[PDB]
């Protein structure tokens, strides 16, 4: 029911399964023989993602699940200038 | 100086001597000669101060200029303002072209330029031939000027004299024993130009000189030229040169009867039959070596007529109007073939008549056949496509249905015409680039009008698929205007021109139906102009959000669903949200703006101006360029 | 109304949803429902301050604006080893690299 | 001014406008000729009155010229009277709601898709800011229209 995203350094970022599954590559990584449907772990082991980058990625997962179409305006995402240029590449790697 | 150039420009324009003396003296040698040796840009077209002296025939100001100075007539100027406005002409060129003999004689004694050759090698005699003044022409030859100067298409001075109504010029040229068989680029030698404007005196003037008969490049004899021009006065004159034979005598009468059948100025239905019946009886006059009428294959466009092989059947259709008009078109095709310049002009005239007479299906068939004939000749049928769109919109306004195969054929022909327009734009370096681009944009706009008509009309499902296939092919041809506006942009921006005719009653731009069709066919929804604007990046700039909110809501839904980036910045880095320029249109975008971490991160990168060059995947380097 | 929030222990950092009126004990219930460990072994820490089990999130300080959804507040987590409770250890995230140029 | 603006004659209205006519030509009916322009949709006359800043007053029945334009199912007059910038968020919201409602019931121009689109545009602008939203003020339900209490939610609409 809950996916088990982990960064390169080992910082686990467990979140709701559909919250991650909003992205596409995290859906592809879950599907296939890498499923291991124990129904609790469903872990995905990234290799080239720093911890803060995937932290903000999980932030965005929750943020996009919450305000998917509610009202018109949404609060701005708090992307630090230093964490950019690594969040964008992790967006491509996740096809978010 | 530039200001002093305009000061002496008015002095020569008013024809004043004492005013120019104070404005061309009491100075050094360098600045004084500049005023008399430079053109003045007035009214958007440059002209010498001596040109405006020769143009108005102000001989008083310009005669004393040559006495007290050494000003020459070799100053480069324009030719005329009657739709030419091209430069390169000398100052003597406009001296003969202004119809003033008093200014020609003064320029000869001070540096005569009678043998001037411009980019079009147009001597002052050519302008004198265009002016048609006998005194100017006679004196200009007296100053040792060549008369056989031919342009790129061999514009002999006898041709322009034969083309124009100045019959005094052409009769003086033969007294100098000029060439009668002046071969042109298209093969038009003397009699082709003379016997086309109904100049009975000019054609008679060359009978003695024996201009003979030679087939030009369009496969037409000079006798057949008079028959095509609906000028019966010179048709009978050209039949009496004692070398016509039986084959070329009746066919000239048939051509004259066919040309008289459908024309704007000369539309005579009694003379059309009588000339044809005279030609019909001349063929069937002996019974031995009888000139039997060869029969063209039947054409569905002209109903199902199979010509008139007998005088009896021609008589039976004398009282019926459209049969005589339809019969004259077939015989005109038999004589002139499918390669004449004006073979389809009677067909277009008949189509316009039928459209004015509310006959639609026959008009569409005739205009389709005329379009096919003109397309076989590789000509800009943009006017024909505009006519098609106009009659389709006229049918729509009167709620008359338009058949789907008709608009399918018109759209396919327009797609091919756009292909050849791109070809003409590509190969031409600087010859007629502006004209080719204008024709290209007109073709694209006519295609859009026909597309809008097709969307409004009901069409067959398979033929709707054919329409989608034609539009798909055109999109894969990727049309592009001067601003880089793609086909999708012109179906979005309200600044897209619409013709003044009935097309203005059917074509509302932006159009909700057209954008749905273009995206369904597969238009690149992220296509950028020279400024980088997308299709959605322009629809927000609509200045009527609430007048046609149904229109603006449908297109933004269609553009977003196709996958247009809502963040694609222009060259000035303005998002469609930022270029909303409208309260309402901003609201609709905010609803359809699908979220993306990639978009937000790219906005953060671009706003912070981080050095992203060669630190990201190469396919992402373009993506930061968008956001 | 409700917020989302982070529960951090050592390196693990789990995200969850919780009401303002939801108590700390309910957060322990959901942590047990995911992390599969009994809540009596678990202590939830706002920064370093121990939280009462019956205290709601609004009483603790997790309002709809203080714990902003896109940047939620960090809730510490301490487990129990045998009969002794472990200390609150939270490893920080990886340091972002220096801004180029 | 009002006589020539109720009928489609922009030339006389303009000529009086540069002849220093009444910018607020009040009447017993309480009009301005902006109301009269809105009643017949002479959009050029509306432009002429806007270019001289003919102002906006409340009609005898409680109507601004923008409201009269919205009631008469004339969208272009709503556009020109909304672009005059002397109208706040509440006025914009109520004008759009009135126009969308007026397209729902009128024999000359009954386009239900226009009704839904204009009502949804009005609702979106009501919930534009998320916070500080101009929430509806729906009266208790009327038995004639079933018992539905308007639509105070985007999903409700």
Count of extended strands of chain A: 3
Beta-strand residue percentage of chain B? under 5%
Structural class of chain A: alpha+beta
Q: Which range does the strand content of chain A fall in?
A: 5-15%
Supply the helix-strand structural class of chain B: mainly alpha
Succession of helices and strands of chain A? EEHHEHH
CATH class group of chain A: Alpha Beta
Spatial arrangement of strands, main beta sheet of chain B: 1-2
Please name the CATH architecture of chain A. Answer: 2-Layer Sandwich
Question: Could you walk me through the main structural features you see in this protein, from its secondary elements to its overall organization?
Answer:
- The structure is cut from a larger assembly and holds one copy of chain A (96 residues), two copies of chain B and one copy of chain C (101 residues).
- Chain A has 96 residues and is an alpha+beta fold.
- In chain A, 36% of the residues lie in helices and 10% in strands.
- Chain A has one domain (17-93): Potassium Channel Kv1.1, Chain A (2-Layer Sandwich).
- In chain B, a hairpin with a 2-residue loop joins strand 1 and strand 2 (45-47).
- In chain B, helix 1 (2-13) runs parallel beside helix 4 and helix 25 packs across helix 27.
- Chain C is of the alpha+beta class.
- Chain C has helices at residues 24-35, 57-60; strands spanning 3-9, 12-18, 43-46, 49-50, 74-78, 80-81, 84-85.
- Chains in contact: A-B, A-C, A-D, B-C, B-D.
- The interface between B and D is medium-sized, with 14 and 17 residues.
- Chain C: Residues 1-66 form the Ubiquitin-like domain.
- Chain C: Keywords: Acetylation, Host-virus interaction, Nucleus, Phosphoprotein, Transcription, Transcription regulation, Ubl conjugation pathway.
Attribute tags:
part of a larger assembly; 4 chains; A: 96 residues; alpha+beta; Potassium Channel Kv1.1, Chain A; 3 strands; 10% strand; B: 627 residues; mainly alpha; two-stranded antiparallel sheet; 2 strands; Ankyrin_rpt (chain B); ubl conjugation pathway (chain B); ubiquitin-like ligase-substrate adaptor activity (chain B); metal-binding (chain B); nucleus (chain B)
């Amino acid at each position: 029911m809950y996916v088990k995203l982990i960064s390169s350094d080992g910082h686990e970022f467990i979140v709701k399964r559909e919250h991650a599954l909003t992205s596409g590559t995290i859906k592809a990584m879950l599907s296939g023989p890498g499923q291991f449907a124990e129904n609790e772990t469903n872990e995905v082991n990234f290799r080239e993602i720093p911890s803060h980058v995937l932290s903000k990625v999980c932030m965005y997962f929750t943020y996009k699940v919450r305000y998917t179409n509610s009202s018109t305006e949404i609060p701005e995402f708090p992307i630090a200038p230093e964490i950019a240029l690594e969040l964008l590449m992790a967006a491509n790697f996740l096809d978010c | 100086m530039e200001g002093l150039a305009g000061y002496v420009y008015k002095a020569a324009s008013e024809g004043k001597v004492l005013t120019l003396a104070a404005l061309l003296l009491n100075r050094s040698e360098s600045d004084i000669r500049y005023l008399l040796g430079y053109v003045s840009q007035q009214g958007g077209q440059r002209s010498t101060p001596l040109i405006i002296a020769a143009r108005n025939g102000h001989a008083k100001v310009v005669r004393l200029l040559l006495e007290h100075y050494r000003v020459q007539t070799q100053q480069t100027g324009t030719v005329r303002f009657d739709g030419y406005v091209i430069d390169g002409a000398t100052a003597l060129w406009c001296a003969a072209g202004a119809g003033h003999f008093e200014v020609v004689k003064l320029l000869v004694s001070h540096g005569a330029n009678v043998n001037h050759t411009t980019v079009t090698n147009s001597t002052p005699l050519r302008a004198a031939c265009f002016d048609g003044r006998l005194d100017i022409v006679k004196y200009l030859v007296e100053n040792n000027a060549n008369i056989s100067i031919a342009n790129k298409y061999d514009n002999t001075c006898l041709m322009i004299a034969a083309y124009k109504g100045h019959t005094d010029v052409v009769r003086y040229l033969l007294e100098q024993r000029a060439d009668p068989n002046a071969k042109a680029h298209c093969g038009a030698t003397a009699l082709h130009f003379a016997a086309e404007a109904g100049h009975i005196d000019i054609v008679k003037e060359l009978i003695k000189w024996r201009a003979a008969i030679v087939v030009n490049g369009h496969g037409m004899t000079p006798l057949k030229v008079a028959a095509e021009s609906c000028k019966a006065d010179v048709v009978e004159l050209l039949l009496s040169h004692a070398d016509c034979d039986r084959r070329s005598r009746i066919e000239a009468l048939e051509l004259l009867g066919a040309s008289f059948a459908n024309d704007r100025e000369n539309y005579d239905i009694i003379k059309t039959y009588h000339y044809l019946y005279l030609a019909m009886l001349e063929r069937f006059q002996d019974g031995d070596n009888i000139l039997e009428k060869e029969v063209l294959p039947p054409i569905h466009a002209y109903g199902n007529r199979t010509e008139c092989r007998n005088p009896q059947e021609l008589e039976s259709i004398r009282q019926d109007r459209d049969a005589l008009h339809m019969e004259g078109l077939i015989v005109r095709e038999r004589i002139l073939g499918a390669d004449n310049i004006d073979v389809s002009h009677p067909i277009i005239y008949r189509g316009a008549v039928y459209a004015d007479n509310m006959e639609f299906e026959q008009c569409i068939k005739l205009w389709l056949h005329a379009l096919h004939l003109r397309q076989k000749g590789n000509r800009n049928t943009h006017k024909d496509l505009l006519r098609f769109a106009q009659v389709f919109s006229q049918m729509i306004h009167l709620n008359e249905t338009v058949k789907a195969p008709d608009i399918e054929c018109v759209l396919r022909c327009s797609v091919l015409e756009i292909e050849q327009s791109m070809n003409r734009v590509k190969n031409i370096s600087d010859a007629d680039v502006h004209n080719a681009m204008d024709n290209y944009e007109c073709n694209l706009y006519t295609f859009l009008y026909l597309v809008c008509i097709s969307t409004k009309t009901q069409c067959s499902e398979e033929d709707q698929c054919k329409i989608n296939k034609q539009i798909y092919n055109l999109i894969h041809l990727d049309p592009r205007t001067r601003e880089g506006f793609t086909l999708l942009h012109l179906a979005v921006n309200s600044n897209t021109p619409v013709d003044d005719f009935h097309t203005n009653d059917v074509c509302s731009f932006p159009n909700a139906l057209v954008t749905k069709l273009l995206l369904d066919c597969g238009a690149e929804v992220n296509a950028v102009d020279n400024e980088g604007n997308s299709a959605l990046h322009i629809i927000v700039q609509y200045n009527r959000p609430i007048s046609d909110f149904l229109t603006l809501h449908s297109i933004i839904i269609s553009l977003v669903e196709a996958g247009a980036h809502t963040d694609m910045t222009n060259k000035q880095n303005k998002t469609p949200l930022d270029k909303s320029t409208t309260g309402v249109s901003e609201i609709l975008l905010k609803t359809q703006m699908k979220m993306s971490l990639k978009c937000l991160a790219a906005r953060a990168v671009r706003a912070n101006d981080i050095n992203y060059q060669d630190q990201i995947p190469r396919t992402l380097e373009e993506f930061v360029g968008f956001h | 109304m409700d917020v989302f929030l982070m529960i951090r222990r050592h390196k693990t950092t789990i995200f969850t949803d919780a009401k303002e009126s939801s108590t700390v004990f309910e957060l322990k219930r959901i942590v047990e429902g995911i992390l599969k460990r009994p809540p009596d072994e678990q202590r939830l820490y706002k920064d370093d301050q121990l939280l009462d089990d019956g205290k709601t999130l609004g009483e603790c300080g997790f309002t709809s604006q203080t714990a902003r959804p896109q940047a939620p507040a960090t809730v510490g987590l301490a487990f129990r080893a045998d009969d002794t409770f472990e200390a609150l250890c939270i490893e920080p995230f990886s340091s972002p690299p220096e801004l180029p140029d």
